[PDB]
Design an enzyme around this catalytic site. Structure first.
Site, PDB file in Angstrom:
ATOM      1  N   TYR A  59     -11.113  11.891   5.772  1.00  0.00           N
ATOM      2  CA  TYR A  59     -11.022  12.290   7.177  1.00  0.00           C
ATOM      3  C   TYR A  59      -9.890  13.334   7.252  1.00  0.00           C
ATOM      4  O   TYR A  59      -9.188  13.561   6.278  1.00  0.00           O
ATOM      5  CB  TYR A  59     -10.899  11.062   8.090  1.00  0.00           C
ATOM      6  CG  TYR A  59      -9.813  10.078   7.734  1.00  0.00           C
ATOM      7  CD1 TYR A  59      -8.472  10.438   7.770  1.00  0.00           C
ATOM      8  CD2 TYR A  59     -10.110   8.760   7.441  1.00  0.00           C
ATOM      9  CE1 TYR A  59      -7.465   9.538   7.484  1.00  0.00           C
ATOM     10  CE2 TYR A  59      -9.111   7.838   7.148  1.00  0.00           C
ATOM     11  CZ  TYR A  59      -7.785   8.233   7.167  1.00  0.00           C
ATOM     12  OH  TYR A  59      -6.776   7.373   6.862  1.00  0.00           O
TER      13      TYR A  59
ATOM     14  N   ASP B 138       0.859  -1.184   0.000  1.00  0.00           N
ATOM     15  CA  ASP B 138       0.000   0.000   0.000  1.00  0.00           C
ATOM     16  C   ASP B 138       0.898   1.239   0.000  1.00  0.00           C
ATOM     17  O   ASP B 138       1.752   1.398   0.860  1.00  0.00           O
ATOM     18  CB  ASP B 138      -0.914   0.020   1.223  1.00  0.00           C
ATOM     19  CG  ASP B 138      -1.713   1.304   1.363  1.00  0.00           C
ATOM     20  OD1 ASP B 138      -2.655   1.490   0.569  1.00  0.00           O
ATOM     21  OD2 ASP B 138      -1.368   2.120   2.250  1.00  0.00           O
TER      22      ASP B 138
ATOM     23  N   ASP C 214       1.334   5.143   0.570  1.00  0.00           N
ATOM     24  CA  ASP C 214       0.700   6.270   1.232  1.00  0.00           C
ATOM     25  C   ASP C 214       1.633   7.475   1.091  1.00  0.00           C
ATOM     26  O   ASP C 214       2.295   7.870   2.053  1.00  0.00           O
ATOM     27  CB  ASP C 214       0.361   5.959   2.699  1.00  0.00           C
ATOM     28  CG  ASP C 214      -0.315   7.122   3.431  1.00  0.00           C
ATOM     29  OD1 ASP C 214      -0.717   8.098   2.744  1.00  0.00           O
ATOM     30  OD2 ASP C 214      -0.413   7.064   4.692  1.00  0.00           O
TER      31      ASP C 214
ATOM     32  N   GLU D 239       2.105  11.123   0.930  1.00  0.00           N
ATOM     33  CA  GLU D 239       1.456  12.357   1.323  1.00  0.00           C
ATOM     34  C   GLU D 239       2.435  13.511   1.162  1.00  0.00           C
ATOM     35  O   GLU D 239       3.157  13.789   2.101  1.00  0.00           O
ATOM     36  CB  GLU D 239       1.008  12.266   2.782  1.00  0.00           C
ATOM     37  CG  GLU D 239       0.203  11.009   3.096  1.00  0.00           C
ATOM     38  CD  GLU D 239      -0.588  11.010   4.401  1.00  0.00           C
ATOM     39  OE1 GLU D 239      -0.650  12.060   5.068  1.00  0.00           O
ATOM     40  OE2 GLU D 239      -1.139   9.940   4.748  1.00  0.00           O
TER      41      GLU D 239
END
Ligand code: CA
Length: 625
Positions: A247, A168, A170, A172
């Protein structure tokens, strides 16, 4: 068909005291483990000392106790985030020796996940990479073809070694500055796609070798800005799915109170027109061309709080003032002298200590469909999600056609913990009841991996001894079946002795691995002739063809110049590198040098490589002349 993908924080095993064993994996389809990291200049971590970096520390990548990292690690390499928690820590009654954990990285959280998958045989494990703190090097790694390859290859090796079912990403965030000192470029847009193509290709190659279907996912930004800096439509077609982080839309970095994860547009919200709410973000993604079945909806198992916030509208959408410490955020569950105030509350902590307690009153926004607490006395405001708001979000997932729910994170649900004891209903049971109907009770459907490195340990006029690398399974490998023409044999270990064979006969032995539920691998074979230096090794093997290697050792009293290897092989060889195939007759092979491989010193070795089709055989009767 719906998915529940839960995030497990590596660091939860310390102060928070949430262990892998505590996890009820009947309530999950997928477990994402956070985090692993990228090596650069021999270290990993984020050294920035800017205040927005919560972990200002780096570590060396070279680790004597970790076989994969017991070397100078090149730039772009996927590496363990914290080796002690990940693979070194010994867990009681696990079966691990001291050597297994001390020098072979077979212990830690990864060991516990292997036990968890066995207990719950439907469960798939994913290693999450980067995140907010460790995204400083993705841009550097993705900018160069050579570091993308290194990364993709290291990812495949990581998965094989530590028993994960996928990776995965991620990042950012591509092309934008998050923490000053971190790398980011506009070409991150084209380079993120290239990285996922390079990883996917590597995973497809290895999945064919291994008999596995490996997964690739990402965690992405829920904003038009993220969309503008990435090629979402293209990447939706490369990935298995996208974990959209719907979120952290609002929190203690802003001076107005707001909702962390609002579901629908509330026009009374000053920021309504930024689309920082769930339905807004999904509209951004679908308008970019992303199919709605490729999205898994992110939901939070935490809340966010401001310390001093205005009294009108029960605290909602009001101005907030900083505290004595200069920060707007309130003192969250795990905050202490070293962290300062982060405004982050586990749901458990809220339900046990804040909802309609200690002066906090619960209110409900029936337009946004989310709750919030406000203490009129202290002025503290908290945005959070509860079972009511979670049920609205599961209804949205089912109506809009999303393919599941992802949640951050496992330790924040109602549990008993060192700092609170929540006994009320659990967010996770809401996701299960609403998206699956009830806990998963499925049998093992995952077959064991393909057999590799079949070798002849000893040969006879009437017998043969075979050994091979042990296959792996999620529950366990129960036996190996070997077939040759009409005959059949089996063994519970990765070796066998076969007797009562016709002398001077060619046999082709096909081996498959079985598990208890009755799954099986796809056959691999080797061709052996019974009885009446060049060492041949198989580097990679799919069913139809394989890559090989020959090491030619000179045991000579002279140098070897213009060497010619002659041998017989009961099999077909198609491509040779650092060599040419001179002739062939009845599986006899003449090989010659590439002109800059002419000279092999006495005691020296010439190493050449090739490919073949069909199954491997034994290099026999070899001569160097
Ligand atoms: Ca299995």
């Amino acid at each position: 068909s719906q998915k529940i993908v839960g995030y497990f924080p590596s660091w939860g095993v310390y102060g928070r005291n949430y262990q892998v064993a505590d996890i009820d994996a009947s309530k999950l389809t997928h477990l994402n483990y956070a985090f692993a990291d990228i090596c650069w200049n021999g270290k990993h971590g984020n050294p920035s000392t800017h205040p927005d970096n919560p972990n200002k520390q780096t570590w060396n990548c070279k680790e004597s106790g970790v076989p994969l990292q017991n070397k100078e690690v090149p730039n772009g390499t996927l590496v363990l985030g914290e080796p002690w928690a990940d693979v070194t820590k010994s867990y009681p009654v696990s079966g691990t020796t001291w050597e297994d954990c001390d020098k072979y990285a077979r212990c830690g959280n990864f060991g516990e996940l292997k036990r968890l998958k066995a207990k719950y045989p439907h469960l798939k494990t994913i290693i999450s990479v980067g995140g907010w703190t460790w995204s400083n090097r993705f841009s550097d790694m993705a900018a160069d073809e050579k570091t993308r390859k290194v990364f993709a290859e290291s990812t495949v090796a990581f998965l094989r070694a530590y028993g994960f079912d996928g990776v995965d990403l991620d990042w950012e965030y591509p092309g934008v500055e998050t923490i000053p000192g971190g790398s980011y470029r506009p070409e991150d847009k084209q380079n993120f796609t290239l990285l996922l193509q390079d990883v996917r290709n590597a995973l497809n190659k290895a999945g064919a070798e291994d008999g596995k279907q490996y997964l690739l996912t990402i965690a992405s930004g829920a904003s038009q800005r993220y969309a503008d800096h990435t090629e979402l439509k293209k990447i939706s077609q490369i990935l298995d799915w996208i974990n959209i982080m719907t979120y952290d839309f609002h929190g203690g970095w802003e001076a107005t109170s707001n909702h962390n994860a609002a579901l629908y547009k509330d026009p009374n919200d000053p920021a309504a027109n930024t689309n920082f709410y769930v339905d807004g973000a999904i509209n951004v993604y679908t308008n970019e061309g992303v199919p709605v079945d490729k999205l898994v909806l992110g939901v939070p198992f935490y809340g966010r709080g401001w310390k001093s916030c205005g009294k009108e509208n029960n605290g909602q959408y009001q101005p907030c003032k900083p505290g004595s410490d200069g920060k707007l955020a309130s003192k969250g569950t795990w905050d202490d002298y070293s962290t300062g105030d982060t405004g982050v509350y586990d749901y458990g902590d809220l339900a046990a200590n804040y909802v309609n307690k200690n002066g906090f009153v619960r209110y409900w926004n029936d337009t946004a469909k989310v709750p919030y607490l406000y203490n009129a006395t202290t002025g503290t405001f908290i945005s959070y999600d509860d079972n009511e708001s979670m049920k609205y979000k599961t209804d949205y997932i089912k109506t809009k056609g999303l393919s599941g729910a992802m949640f951050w994170e496992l330790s924040g649900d109602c549990r008993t913990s060192p700092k609170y004891s929540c006994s009320g209903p659990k967010l996770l049971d809401t996701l299960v009841k609403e998206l699956l109907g009830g806990p998963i009770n499925q049998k093992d459907t995952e077959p064991p991996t393909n057999v590799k490195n079949i070798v002849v340990t000893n040969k006879n006029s009437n017998s043969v001894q075979l050994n091979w690398t042990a296959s792996t399974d999620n529950v366990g490998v129960t036996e190996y079946e070997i077939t040759a023409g009409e005959e059949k044999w089996s063994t519970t270990t990765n070796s066998i002795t076969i007797k009562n064979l016709k002398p001077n006969t060619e046999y082709t032995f096909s081996i498959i691995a079985k598990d208890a539920a009755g799954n099986k691998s796809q056959p691999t074979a080797l061709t052996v002739k019974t009885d009446e230096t060049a060492t041949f090794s198989v580097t990679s093997n799919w069913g139809s063809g394989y890559n090989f290697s020959i090491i030619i050792k000179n045991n000579g009293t002279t140098p070897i110049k213009n060497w010619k290897l002659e041998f017989d092989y009961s099999g077909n060889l198609t491509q040779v590198w650092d060599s040419k195939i001179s002739s062939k007759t009845n599986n006899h092979y003449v090989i010659t040098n590439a002109g800059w491989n002419g000279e092999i010193p006495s005691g020296g070795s010439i190493t050449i490589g090739g490919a073949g089709t069909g199954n491997p055989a034994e290099l026999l009767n070899a001569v160097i002349s």
